[PDB]
Amino acid sequence: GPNICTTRGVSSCQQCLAVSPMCAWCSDEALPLGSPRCDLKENLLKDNCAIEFPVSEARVLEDRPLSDKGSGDSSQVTQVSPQRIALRLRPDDSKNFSIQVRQVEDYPVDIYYLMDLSYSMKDDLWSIQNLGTKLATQMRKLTSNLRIGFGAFVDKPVSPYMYISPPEALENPCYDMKTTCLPMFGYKHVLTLTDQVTRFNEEVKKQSVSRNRDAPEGGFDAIMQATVCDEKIGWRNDASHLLVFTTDAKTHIALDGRLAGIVQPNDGQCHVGSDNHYSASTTMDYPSLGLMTEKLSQKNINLIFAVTENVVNLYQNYSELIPGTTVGVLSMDSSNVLQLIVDAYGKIRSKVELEVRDLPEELSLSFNATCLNNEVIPGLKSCMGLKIGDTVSFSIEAKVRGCPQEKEKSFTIKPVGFKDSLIVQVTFDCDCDDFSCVRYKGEMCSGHGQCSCGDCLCDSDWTGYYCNCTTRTDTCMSSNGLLCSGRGKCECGSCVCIQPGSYGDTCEKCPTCPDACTFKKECVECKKFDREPYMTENTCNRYCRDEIESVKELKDTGKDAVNCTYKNEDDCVVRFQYYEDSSGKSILYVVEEPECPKG
């Protein structure tokens, strides 16, 4: 059959393959032929010659099962299933594969406490003395392994920020306040990560505050340093990491240092030394959020912004820029720093997002995620509301546009935060008119696609006849972590609400939506009765994730909370109160012992 391969084969093998992976070529010694030389071996084989016709493939090269417990002797505790796999794609073809990610319980955890020692913390530096052992236990019962460290910062010890040197006798204290405080330091590393969770208490005890003229501190300076200095802080290669950043103040950002007369940008390199004092604070400007991420990410550190309400809103907004970062609300005495690290830990261990380091240029990578048994949500590649010890699955598809130059070209794929990962060494086996294309709005292939003969060959992160449709979902975001507010699907970066009677960029807006209650009923009717469709779908675990805790006789009184009442399959009237606030905690107080017909 004279077709695609026929029309673009005459040339030579090279081009014959360069057409479609559904073609082939054949000829060696001197065997003749009157039929095309480039075909679909099926149309070709019944015409002699029979082995130069490759087929793409992805051979796993390393399995190793998911394990179910952190560090247990020799077994290299793994959290991702395949670790190595070799891809060999031929011209313009593709090849799907998969990946497994387990939240391996009892996995060692590192906790670096990095507090702001501005005078507004002398107190704070008290209701922490106990903490460290107090920590050690709440942690213990959630990890057979725990290491903690400590760090302190203020700001660059320079003219604007620091007390220049007015009285010669002010380079040493809080001279006019009398109190007599320790001089300015920027970033000091106190206690390196150890298991002797007492050294921590025997340390903060010696610690004292300092003072700074300017409101904004030099926290970020520190954050960068207790993250890329590792041999110092002593983070554990195979462990979950935590940088507890706690402050009650605003913060300097990059470019501010200009005033102090500091214009050399942050190189993101470790600059601590023997004295454990960031020895560049004065010569190097504060790091930018971009550098902060790039490094926070690379080193697999989980920054936690423990801050005071007076400045909390500020840091939420800031983390929105440094994704993967959680923010809790500390206190004036940090008294509650304890149950803050925890809720953070868990909150982080509650999700798995797949990231791609060093992917090749002409290589395309589409994903599909499976996180709720069988139910696959085509498009995403991240998941939340998961329980420590649970496993998820992602299906990746690899695809090359054209054919680069041979090379062990190898990129990776791994969960943000995780040490484990699936290295993927690709290899490429590759040995009309560009004019008339389609045009979206002035550009050939919407300026996002190559134009080969018939259609366009979209660039990575683009799809569709024209290549206008993107492969992004971020825009479909929505403060929920649930794309399109669970009210709609995400197609081409923009949500298309399934019209439950809603609208909005992420379908967030839905004024005629049924009573806030009606929604959270299928919730209490499974977690407290097993009944209701939500248990049938075998969910009611990943979805209904509030805190249904049957209340005493009387219900509640907490204002700013709603009440609800419904009749159960049983015909009795259940009374319950919805409630949100605090850490952002939401619980559903349920009157115990409904009202059933007497008799």
């Binding site: 930018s288 294309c437 009237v573």
Partner: protein
């Protein structure tokens, strides 16, 4: 769009002095030779005990490339008492900012410290020094009796500066009033006139200055950057200053009035920590004599294809219209971490095209942070967002990033040629570079063939050697040049011609030049004064009828012309270049005589038809439209036959339909050389006779408010045949329709209420919600989904008022979200029940006493809605039991809407109508 970069002037400075950190042109009226100023914030001086005080070097322009430091002050630190210094100059960063207005030049030292006549300090108030000829005064507005940080003790005034047309100074000090920041404007004159060596704190007369403000603003950094220009009716430049830390570090840009220093406009960032304001610039980008604002955010994070947040910074480009409001746009960097809007710099008309250009620098982009400057050209429409040029720092680091472009001055033609120039400084490597603009040259080329249609037979004109007659034809390639500035005279173009380019390699070149017998000849030219288009003629014959059998493919003549590197002044060499968007090759074609009657001339018969298939373009959204063109030739061969479709401004060409077996895959393309918006389609160069042809051109119309009844297309076939070359222009309209899917929705929040009713007290003459009943609540939404919007609608909400002189749902009040006004035929809270100060089943209006709430609706576009929020109260008198079973009630309330008016009026409409109902079922479970 083109600065020399081969050999540019290279200046340098002491190792580590930060030479190049600040730059500017010096152009004294007292002389004819300009110089270039370069601040060296960290230099060392012969100043008594003043280590690293900084300097400002005046560089000469004349092969010598020397820079001798301008002497602003040789004085060490003054005293306040024996041993207790009054000021500290060492490490003051003098030179950190350097502007010049004429024979005068401002130079500040913003890390200059002062101890004050009061207590013993070391406050960084900063200080400038204004030189002018020989007299040198000291400017220091922030050094006054108002000390410390809650005052002006930490301004670092001089952190930014600038002069205004009417000669005045704009000085910024980021530290003022708890780092809120400050702006101070003084008259140059008053500055030198009110000077006095014996008065550390001088009172200048007409001094403009911002005042301290509320604490919320602390740490904003007003004065971090500053630029000037006019932003009202007329007058003098007003003040423009960036405020990095402004907002929640969203950063703002303030534009103050230059006469009274009062606020005029603000600009806010979009992304925290981006450092909006780090830089600003005023200059007119679109030659509309109205100044234009440029704000740079060196740390802006945008997203890549994979949608990941990435740092590349952007530049806000706000265009000022006569109105007073601005029409802004954005421009993001390219390389990550390079810091794009890190330094914006106005040039004049870098190419004298009639519009000003602007340069943006990404200090740490390329090679190894070697630094990059992108120059952007301006144009009527706005500022072209595509770098016309790229300056690459050619200097490696050694201790810190070179920083090419962190600073750069323009808008000054330090030389001959009537074109600007540009200074750029890399203080990491300690140096500055001056790039000299090249003279733009605009050139025109002509190319015509003596006989248009070559006749194989007829062959006058004989060959060269073997005197044998052949069918010749002539070529006339003429050329026109000349541009502005300094360059003329010379101008020589190396041309080149070709026959049968549509053939190139592979022989069969049906045409050759007379005396050459070659398919390609070349030559030179020369000219200068525009208009003196020096021509050059050639003669070409056609091969013998027997050496080729191709007689359809036209024989095109191709001429390409290029300039030579030798038409520059003794400026140590400065070759110009041709206008960016200008072709260095034109081409015309010839056609062998074939099938043209007997008179030997071809005269076609063109016709275009278009049936109104789709015919239905709904106003509002982007409606798709495709038309079936039917071009056909019923005469003789039409040369360069092509379909010409004149499309509407509301329509845009997609492409030719191919998803079909009946249409031709024409090779169309969209263009508009003349504001005519047209798509062109090839129909065959020789376009054979009786060649009917169907094909589909699809696109998308975008209508527009009010406007007229319908959008039309214009179709015609144009050919290059001397006779009957075109066809009757056939037009085709498509009516605009109106479709507005409007809908109404309701929700009775608690779609249920159980009467056992958790406690309750029947209190005669109630005074609060709880004393009444629970809060039932209905919500109605009217929303227009359809594409076309409307301008007026009515809303009728009937409400379940009472059943038998017995109240049902006691309405407490109602709210509205959107363009809507509502009215109740009855007063709502007759019992004035303020908030809490701690026919027997369905009860509708058909069977119950009604309360009508009417609402008049404004204009709802596509994707908008109005919303009624009715907040009632279940009057608990739904209590009875002594009589049968007092139970099960379905409280109903309905709401209907009527669409009465659209803003089109000239188009056919219809009345949109519909309604819906919402119930609140009250019942008994433990009856």
């Amino acid at each position: 769009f083109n600065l020399d970069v081969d050999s540019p002037a290279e200046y340098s400075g002491p190792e580590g002095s930060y030479f190049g950190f600040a730059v500017d042109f010096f152009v004294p009226s007292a002389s004819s030779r300009m110089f270039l100023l370069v601040g060296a914030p960290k230099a060392n001086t012969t100043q008594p005990g003043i280590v690293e005080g900084g300097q400002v070097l005046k560089c000469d322009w004349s092969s010598t490339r020397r820079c001798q430091p301008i002497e602003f002050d040789a004085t060490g630190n003054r005293d306040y008492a024996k041993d207790d210094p009054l000021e500290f100059k060492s490490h003051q960063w003098f030179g950190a900012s350097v502007r010049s207005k004429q024979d005068k030049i401002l130079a500040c030292a913003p890390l200059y410290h002062w101890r004050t006549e009061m207590k013993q300090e070391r406050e960084p108030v900063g200080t400038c020094f204004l030189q002018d000829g020989t007299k040198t005064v000291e400017y220091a507005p922030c050094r006054s009796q108002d000390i410390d940080a809650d005052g002006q003790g930490f301004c670092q005034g001089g952190f930014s500066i600038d002069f205004t047309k009417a000669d005045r100074v704009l000085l910024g000090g980021p530290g003022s009033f708890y780092w809120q920041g400050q702006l101070i404007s003084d008259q140059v004159a008053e500055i030198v006139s009110k000077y006095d060596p014996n008065v550390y704190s001088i009172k200048y007369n007409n001094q403009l200055a911002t005042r301290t403000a509320q604490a919320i603003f602390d740490d904003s950094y007003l004065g971090y950057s500053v630029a000037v220009g006019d932003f009202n009716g007329d007058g003098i430049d007003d003040f423009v200053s960036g405020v990095p830390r402004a907002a929640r570090t969203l950063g703002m840009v303030y534009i103050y009035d230059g006469k009274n220093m009062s606020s005029l406009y603000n600009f806010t960032g979009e992304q925290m920590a981006a450092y909006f304001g780090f830089s600003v610039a005023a200059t007119d980008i679109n030659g509309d004599d109205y100044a234009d604002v440029f704000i740079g955010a060196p740390l802006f994070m945008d997203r890549g294809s994979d949608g990941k947040l990435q740092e590349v910074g952007q530049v806000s480009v706000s265009l000022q219209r006569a109105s007073g409001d601005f029409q802004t746009t954005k421009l993001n960097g390219f390389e990550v971490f390079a810091r794009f809007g890190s330094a914006i710099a106005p040039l004049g008309d870098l190419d004298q095209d009639g519009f000003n250009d602007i340069a943006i620098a990404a200090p740490y982009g390329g090679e190894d942070k070697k630094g990059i400057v992108y120059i952007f050209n301006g144009r009527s429409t706005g500022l072209n967002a595509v770098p016309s040029q790229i300056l690459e720092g050619q200097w490696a680091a050694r201790s810190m990033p070179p920083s090419f472009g962190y600073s750069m001055k323009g808008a000054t033609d330090i030389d001959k040629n009537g074109y600007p120039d540009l200074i750029v400084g890399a203080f990491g490597v300690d140096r500055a570079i001056l790039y000299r603009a090249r003279p733009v040259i605009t050139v025109n080329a002509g190319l015509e063939v003596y006989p248009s249609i070559l006749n194989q037979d007829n062959k006058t004109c004989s060959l060269p050697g073997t005197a044998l007659k052949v069918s010749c034809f002539n070529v006339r390639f003429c050329l026109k040049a000349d541009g502005k500035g300094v360059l003329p005279r010379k101008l020589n173009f190396q041309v080149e011609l070709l026959l049968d380019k549509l053939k190139q390699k592979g022989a069969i070149r049906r045409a050759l030049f007379l005396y050459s017998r070659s398919p390609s000849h070349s030559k030179n030219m020369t000219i200068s004064r525009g208009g003196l288009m020096q021509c050059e003629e050639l003669i070409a014959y056609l091969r013998d009828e027997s050496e080729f059998r191709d007689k359809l493919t036209p024989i095109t003549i191709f001429m390409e012309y290029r300039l030579d590197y030798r038409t520059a002044a003794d400026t140590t060499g400065l070759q110009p270049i041709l206008n960016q968007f200008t072709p260095a090759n034109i081409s015309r074609q010839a056609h062998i005589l074939l099938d043209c009657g007997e008179d030997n001339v071809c005269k076609p018969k063109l016709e275009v038809s278009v049936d109104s298939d789709q015919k239905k373009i709904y106003i509002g959204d982007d409606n798709p439209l495709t038309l079936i063109v039917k071009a056909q030739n019923q005469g003789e061969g039409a040369y360069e036959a092509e379909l010409i479709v004149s499309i509407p401004l509301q329509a845009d060409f997609i492409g030719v339909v191919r998803n079909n077996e009946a249409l031709a895959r024409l090779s169309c393309a969209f263009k508009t050389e003349n504001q005519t918006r047209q798509v062109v389609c090839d129909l065959g160069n020789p376009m054979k006779a009786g060649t009917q042809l169907l094909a589909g051109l699809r696109f998308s119309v975008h209508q527009q408010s009010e406007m007229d009844t319908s959008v039309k297309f214009d179709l015609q076939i144009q050919s290059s045949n001397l006779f009957d070359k075109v066809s009757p222009v056939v037009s085709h309209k498509v009516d605009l329709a109106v479709l507005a899917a409007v809908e109404i929705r309701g929700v009775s929040s608690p779609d249920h209420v159980f009467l056992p009713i958790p406690n309750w007290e029947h209190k005669e003459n109630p005074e609060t919600e709880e004393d009444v009943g629970p809060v039932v609540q209905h919500i109605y939404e009217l929303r227009n989904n359809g594409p076309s919007s409307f301008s007026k609608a009515m809303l009728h909400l009937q409400w379940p008022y009472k059943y038998n002189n017995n109240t049902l749902l006691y309405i407490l009040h109602y709210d509205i979200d959107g363009p809507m006004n509502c009215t109740s035929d009855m007063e709502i809270n007759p019992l004035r029940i303020k908030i809490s100060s701690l026919d027997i089943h369905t009860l509708g209006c058909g069977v119950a006493q009604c309360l009508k709430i009417v609402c008049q609706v404004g204009r709802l576009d596509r994707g908008k809605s109005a919303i009624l929020y009715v907040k009632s109260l279940l009057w608990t008198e739904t209590f009875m039991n002594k009589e049968n079973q007092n139970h099960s009630y379905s409280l109903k309330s309905s709401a209907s809407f009527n669409v009465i008016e659209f803003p089109y009026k000239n188009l056919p409409i219809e009345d949109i109508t519909n309604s819906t109902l919402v119930t609140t079922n009250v019942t008994w479970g433990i009856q």
